[PDB]
RNA sequence: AAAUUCUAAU
RNA sequence: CCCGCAGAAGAAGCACCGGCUAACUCCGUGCCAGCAGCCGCGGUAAUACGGAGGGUGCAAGCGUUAAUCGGAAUUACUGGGCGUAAAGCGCACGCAGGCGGUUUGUUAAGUCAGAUGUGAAAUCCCCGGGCUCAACCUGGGAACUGCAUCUGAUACUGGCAAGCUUGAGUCUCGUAGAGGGGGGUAGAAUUCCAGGUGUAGCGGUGAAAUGCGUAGAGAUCUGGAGGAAUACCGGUGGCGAAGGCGGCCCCCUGGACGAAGACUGACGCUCAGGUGCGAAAGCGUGGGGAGCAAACAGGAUUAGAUACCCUGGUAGUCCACGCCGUAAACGAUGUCGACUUGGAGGUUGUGCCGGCGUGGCUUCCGGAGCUAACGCGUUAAGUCGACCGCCUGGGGAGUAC
């Protein structure tokens, strides 16, 4: 059955770039609303939109630079069979920097630079890089 | 094939034992067998008996 | 495997047990010479090796090789034997330290003297 | 016995000779006569 | 349609 | 510790030189003597054995043996695998356990931040000092990744309360099918029995012979008995969780799929122990026995033939009940869910006007991608998530206790 929705919109994002595609749609969620705000802030995606009312849809557009995907590599780290937890003096580097990594912390979906500088740790969520 | 897997013989005169005496033991020989189908040397024994 | 797979039974690691069990994790063992012999290697080799039959102080029965040329060992030597294993010999895991208590240096070993007991001239 | 290089030696008394086709027709009188002799020098010399 | 085998040093 | 005295005067060895590994020639022996950590050297022209000359590496030390970690990603938490190299239970149900679609409120258990107490000294690391330097001694700091308490945050996980319909399930109509259990019946054919006609062969093989026949065989015709299996249809066609299921008719019965409408509201997925099903052979009791046919007998072939070939033939194959629990039980590919270019078919539903769509199952080719390659390729061996099973060199061995 289904038990990772999040792992889900990472793959599908994943087969979306790698087959070419214009958008990617799929079932709503606000936690999946969050990561989509962090990947179009950062730049990973154009835009994101949610229709709909009683079965909300979310869909996002996904971009490339050369004729090639934007995003090279997205992973889901904290699944539901092992979660992971980091405090603040130990919050993962992606690429040294280039990357970037998604983390929940007290104060919300957020980015892991923008993490050390509230001084806050949390859960990690992905690696996109 | 060839010769003997074994002889037993019985040499018969005067002075037989006191000169034959010597050639109890193992005899080696190196050369290039009949049954070869290559040009290999090859090294094999026999062993000899006198009583 | 699965972390809940490795948590309910966790990695085994490989024993790895020793090749020289007469010593018992010591480097040198005393023995009596209860038969001395040769005996012949295994394929491709061919020679007259010398070994010993040699019964130590913890009550074990090996077969130790006697290195060098030539030996002065008989029945009811005692001996001081190391390891390490003769390949070609099948069932021969031991060396016989020479220059020990009753064998004696190789004679007329002008190198390598050290490994084989004689006194520099 | 050497058939490649036709030497026929005897261990017993280190004693090496390139006749063997000699040796191989029945004429190994000149093998045996050295053995005897030192098979006598003992005789005499284990009287003790 | 019958029909076994080729030891051991290049 | 300092000064003076006489004299270079008292003070260098060990291992190695074929490759891995820095460093080569001569003589002796001749698979002998011997060397070896792994490949491997030595058979009368040895850079590998022994000696000499030369060189290389450490040096008051040098080598060997024993023990531990590393290399070994070779137990893979960081950080491995299961189509063919070792490795998916024969299949399914299911308790404990592991995991959990979507919204709101509340709690702060997990998680995060700060503060406090504690984490003996020595040791380790950093900045300095003292022995003529060093080892050594020592001043100060950093660290001891931990534990407990107090105060805060509510994004994610958990608890409680209320919901929602998309996962899951129920109801109405219909369809296809060797799905299962029981009973009845039909036709062809083999065998046996009785009788008619008829006379010298029948059968079998590469060729023969065993065997049957003048006591009338084989052939042909008529009547009867009993047992087993269902020609054509028939098709990489259909059904079933797997094993498996094929004449026709009836009775009881499981599942699947399709078109619309209504209903419950997360009731779900996987599953160690446990439980049930499970080809053929085999076992116990009681029946049945046409054909076939282990064991057995005879005749051929052969150097021999305890076989292949021929003539016969008993268990067994069949039925009722009860055991057994194994197969190359194979797609050598565990179950569930999501995403990702195409083409040619087969089978079974339904909507619209011979054509245009939309579901289920199934065969072949092939793109990206993956693989050591062969190959797989929307029915993945491609990209992910949850749970279970299994593997760690070849024999010994799926063997002993
Ligand atoms: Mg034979
Ligand atoms: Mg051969
Ligand atoms: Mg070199
Ligand atoms: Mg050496
Ligand atoms: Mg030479
Ligand atoms: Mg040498
Ligand atoms: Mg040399
Ligand atoms: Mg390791
Ligand atoms: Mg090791
Ligand atoms: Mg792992
Ligand atoms: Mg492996
Ligand atoms: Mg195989
Ligand atoms: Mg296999
Ligand atoms: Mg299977
Ligand atoms: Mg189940
Ligand atoms: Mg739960
Ligand atoms: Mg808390
Ligand atoms: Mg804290
Ligand atoms: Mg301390
Ligand atoms: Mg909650
Ligand atoms: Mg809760
Ligand atoms: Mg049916
Ligand atoms: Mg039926
Ligand atoms: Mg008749
Ligand atoms: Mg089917
Ligand atoms: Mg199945
Ligand atoms: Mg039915
Ligand atoms: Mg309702
Ligand atoms: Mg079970
Ligand atoms: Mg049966
Ligand atoms: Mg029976
Ligand atoms: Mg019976
Ligand atoms: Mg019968
Ligand atoms: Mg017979
Ligand atoms: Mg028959
Ligand atoms: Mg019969
Ligand atoms: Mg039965
Ligand atoms: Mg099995
Ligand atoms: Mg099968
Ligand atoms: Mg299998
Ligand atoms: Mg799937
Ligand atoms: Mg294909
Ligand atoms: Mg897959
Ligand atoms: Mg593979
Ligand atoms: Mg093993
Ligand atoms: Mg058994």
Same mark, same amino acid.
């Given at each position: 059955?289904?038990?990772?929705?999040?792992a889900?919109?990472?793959?599908?994002?994943?087969?979306?770039?790698?087959?070419?595609?214009?958008?990617?749609?799929?079932?709503?969620?606000?936690?999946?609303?969050?990561?989509?705000?962090?990947?179009?802030?950062?730049?990973?995606?154009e835009?994101?939109?949610?229709?709909?009312?009683?079965?909300?849809?979310?869909?996002?557009?996904?971009?490339?630079?050369?004729?090639?995907?934007?995003?090279?590599?997205?992973?889901?780290?904290?699944?539901?069979?092992?979660?992971?937890?980091?405090?603040?003096?130990?919050?993962?580097?992606?690429?040294?920097?280039?990357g970037?990594?998604?983390?929940?912390?007290?104060?919300?979906?957020?980015?892991?630079?923008?993490?050390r500088?509230?001084?806050?740790?949390?859960?990690?969520?992905?690696?996109?890089? | 094939?060839g010769?003997?897997?074994?002889?037993?013989?019985?040499?018969?005169?005067?002075?037989?034992?006191?000169?034959?005496?010597?050639?109890?033991?193992?005899?080696?020989?190196?050369?290039?067998?009949?049954?070869?189908?290559?040009?290999?040397?090859?090294?094999?024994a026999?062993?000899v008996?006198?009583? | 495997?699965?972390?809940?797979?490795?948590?309910?039974?966790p990695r085994?690691?490989?024993?790895?047990?020793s090749?020289?069990?007469?010593?018992?994790?010591?480097?040198?063992?005393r023995?009596?010479?209860?038969?001395?012999?040769?005996?012949?290697?295994?394929?491709?080799?061919?020679?007259?090796?010398?070994?010993?039959?040699?019964?130590?102080?913890?009550?074990?029965?090996?077969?130790?090789?006697?290195?060098?040329?030539?030996?002065?060992?008989?029945?009811?030597?005692?001996?001081?034997?190391?390891?390490?294993?003769?390949?070609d010999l099948?069932?021969?895991?031991?060396?016989?330290?020479?220059?020990?208590?009753?064998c004696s240096?190789?004679?007329?070993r002008?190198?390598?003297?050290?490994?084989?007991?004689?006194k520099?001239? | 016995?050497?058939?490649?290089?036709?030497?026929?030696? !005897?261990?017993? @008394?280190?004693?090496?000779?390139?006749?063997?086709?000699?040796?191989?027709?029945?004429k =190994? !009188?000149?093998? @045996?006569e050295?053995?005897?002799?030192?098979?006598?020098?003992?005789?005499?010399?284990? =009287?003790?």
């Amino acid at each position: 059955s289904m038990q990772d929705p999040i792992a889900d919109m990472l793959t599908r994002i994943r087969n979306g770039q790698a087959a070419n595609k214009a958008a990617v749609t799929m079932p709503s969620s606000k936690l999946k609303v969050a990561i989509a705000n962090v990947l179009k802030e950062e730049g990973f995606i154009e835009d994101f939109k949610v229709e709909g009312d009683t079965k909300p849809e979310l869909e996002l557009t996904l971009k490339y630079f050369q004729g090639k995907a934007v995003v090279e590599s997205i992973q889901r780290v904290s699944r539901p069979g092992l979660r992971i937890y980091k405090r603040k003096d130990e919050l993962p580097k992606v690429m040294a920097g280039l990357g970037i990594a998604v983390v929940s912390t007290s104060k919300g979906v957020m980015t892991d630079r923008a993490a050390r500088q509230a001084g806050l740790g949390g859960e990690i969520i992905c690696y996109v890089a | 094939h060839g010769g003997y897997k074994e002889i037993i013989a019985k040499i018969s005169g005067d002075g037989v034992y006191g000169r034959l005496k010597f050639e109890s033991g193992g005899h080696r020989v190196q050369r290039v067998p009949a049954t070869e189908s290559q040009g290999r040397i090859h090294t094999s024994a026999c062993t000899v008996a006198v009583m | 495997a699965t972390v809940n797979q490795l948590v309910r039974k966790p990695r085994a690691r490989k024993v790895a047990k020793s090749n020289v069990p007469a010593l018992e994790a010591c480097p040198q063992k005393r023995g009596v010479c209860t038969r001395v012999y040769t005996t012949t290697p295994k394929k491709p080799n061919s020679a007259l090796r010398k070994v010993c039959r040699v019964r130590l102080t913890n009550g074990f029965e090996v077969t130790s090789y006697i290195g060098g040329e030539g030996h002065n060992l008989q029945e009811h030597s005692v001996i001081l034997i190391r390891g390490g294993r003769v390949k070609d010999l099948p069932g021969v895991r031991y060396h016989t330290v020479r220059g020990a208590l009753d064998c004696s240096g190789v004679k007329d070993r002008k190198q390598a003297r050290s490994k084989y007991g004689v006194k520099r001239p | 016995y050497n058939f490649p290089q036709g030497r026929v030696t !005897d261990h017993r @008394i280190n004693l090496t000779l390139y006749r063997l086709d000699e040796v191989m027709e029945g004429k =190994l !009188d000149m093998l @045996i006569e050295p053995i005897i002799q030192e098979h006598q020098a003992d005789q005499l010399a284990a =009287l003790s």
